[PDB]
């Protein structure tokens, strides 16, 4: 029921510009919350609030935790860029 997108973002000094929700309870999806105006994600224009996050930099996070996905984003921040694979209901 979804469309999948692979999104690349350069990090800005302020980060990638979006909030991550979910993955708190078993089976709970990880997904995009608020997108910051003029941040990397907004500027790039592909990410949408509500998109389900399924992979970060080649590491799958389906069925995995909020903690893991934040860890992967912190590693991406260190390297200065991230690849996101997302799914959105269509």
């Amino acid at each position: 029921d979804y469309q999948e997108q692979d999104i690349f973002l350069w990090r800005k000094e302020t980060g990638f510009g979006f909030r991550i929700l979910g993955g708190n309870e078993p089976g709970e999806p990880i997904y995009i919350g608020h997108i910051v105006p003029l941040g990397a994600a907004d500027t790039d224009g592909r990410l949408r609030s509500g998109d389900e996050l399924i992979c970060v930099d080649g590491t799958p996070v389906i069925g995995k935790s909020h903690q893991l996905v934040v860890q992967l984003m912190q590693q991406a921040a260190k390297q200065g860029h991230v690849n996101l694979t997302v799914r959105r209901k269509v």
Partner: peptide, 10 residues
């Protein structure tokens, strides 16, 4: 939290 503060900012 209101939707703009919910979740972890990256």
């Amino acid at each position: 939290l209101p939707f703009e503060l919910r979740g972890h900012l990256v």
